[PDB]
């Protein structure tokens, strides 16, 4: 019936501290086709099958990034450095699959409804940092111009294990976190 293909790109910077970010990606319905790693000029497909079916010239994104960054400086000026209030994320933590003790699974941490799109996710098992095999998404857009982001932790369910996902949003006082434990 209905489909949306989006090319979504953004260019942002902070002062105090000074930092810049950029993102260039293509999306289909709610899901990401690819993003370009702007430092390396590489198209990164969300699923490896996409990269076998299709191609994208990542140099094109780098040309867009130069235009994006110039646009940013012109719109900062045209707006007299007007700024918006930050919106802190809502977190959900849920497994990919039916939980069976000792069957490998994936915990998904979904940070939603935040702005600006600068947030880091940290995983913990029984209060200790776990990072092996973790995948973090790039920032996905919303109709309300807020963002969302996915993180994935491979795990093996066991009785009495607790997991936590903590998100550090740019400029927040500290992390917000959610816990999960199996059935």
């Amino acid at each position: 019936r209905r489909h949306v293909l989006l090319q979504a790109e953004f260019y942002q910077r902070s002062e105090g501290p000074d930092k810049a970010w950029a993102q260039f990606g293509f999306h289909f319905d709610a899901d990401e086709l690819f993003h370009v790693e702007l430092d390396a000029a590489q198209t990164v497909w969300r699923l490896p099958e996409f990269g076998r079916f299709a191609s994208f010239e990542a140099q094109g994104a780098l040309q867009n990034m130069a235009v994006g960054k110039q646009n940013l400086e012109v719109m900062i000026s045209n707006s007299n450095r007007s700024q918006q209030d930050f919106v802190t994320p809502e977190l959900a933590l849920f497994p990919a699959e039916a939980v069976s003790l000792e069957e490998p699974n994936v915990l998904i941490c979904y940070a939603d409804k935040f702005w600006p799109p600068v947030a880091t996710m940290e995983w913990r098992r029984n209060g200790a940092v776990v990072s092996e095999g973790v995948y973090d998404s790039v920032y996905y857009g919303r109709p309300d111009l807020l963002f969302r982001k996915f993180s994935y932790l491979p795990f093996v369910p066991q009785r009495g294990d607790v997991y936590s996902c903590a998100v550090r949003h740019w400029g927040a006082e500290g992390p917000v976190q959610r816990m999960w434990e199996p059935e």
Binding site: R1, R2, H3, V4, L5, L6, Q7, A8, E9, F10, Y11, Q12, R13, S14, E15, G16, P17, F26, F28, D29, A30, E32, R46, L47, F50, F53, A54, S55, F56, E57, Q63, N64, V67, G68, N71, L72, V74, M75, I76, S77, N78, S79, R81, S82, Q83, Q84, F86, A96, E97, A98, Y110, W115, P116, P117, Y140, L145, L146, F150, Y152, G171
Partner: protein, 193 residues
């Protein structure tokens, strides 16, 4: 196939801080390529200041900030011809390039039926791993569709091009079936309990 991109137009120039500027180039497809709409949105911070819609053929200011830019871009007929062409060289080209693995992407649901409780008060039908997100999950008691005591979560995005949903039946010779219809399946899945 080699995917195409869309250029951004450039607006005219007229302690801690944060600035954001972005652009979204959207292709809306109804009955595939039969009806195609190109929309390009320009955003500053948390507000859209302007867009181009291929059905309109011109830039429209969405805020006072974009008013100058819409008129500046609207005064350039070659610039407007360029945007109107995006419907073909961006939207139609890209649809042909990715339809096989997006519109035609098909991933079968896995269906699990569990007791929840301490005595049984609820049956959970967990349906995981599917694409596209459109799905019908129904509970039957002795071949009769239940609705009254049925509670469904929204279909949840896993973010990896798969979706899941949970359908709980409140209930106390009884034969309960969770029936799942999905575009990936030639035949519905009947998970008995």
């Amino acid at each position: 196939n080699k995917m195409s991109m869309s250029t951004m137009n450039m607006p005219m120039a007229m302690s801690s801080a944060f600035f954001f500027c972005g652009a979204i180039s959207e292709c809306h497809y109804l009955n595939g390529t039969e009806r195609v709409r190109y929309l390009q949105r320009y955003i500053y911070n948390r507000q859209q200041y302007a867009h181009f819609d291929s059905d309109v053929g011109k830039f429209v200011a969405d805020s006072p900030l974009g008013e100058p830019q819409a008129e500046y871009w609207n005064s350039n007929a070659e610039l407007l011809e360029n945007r109107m062409n995006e419907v073909d060289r961006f939207c139609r080209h890209n649809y042909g390039g990715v339809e096989s693995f997006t519109v035609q992407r098909s991933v079968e649901p896995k269906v699990r039926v569990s007791a929840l409780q301490p005595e049984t008060d609820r049956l959970a039908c967990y349906v995981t791993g599917f694409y596209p997100p459109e799905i019908e999950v129904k509970w039957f008691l002795n071949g009769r569709e239940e609705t009254e005591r049925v509670v469904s979560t929204d279909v949840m995005q896993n973010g990896d091009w798969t979706y899941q949903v949970l359908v709980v039946l409140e209930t106390v010779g009884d034969s309960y079936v969770c029936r799942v219809e999905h575009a990936s399946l030639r035949q519905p899945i009947s998970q008995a309990w």
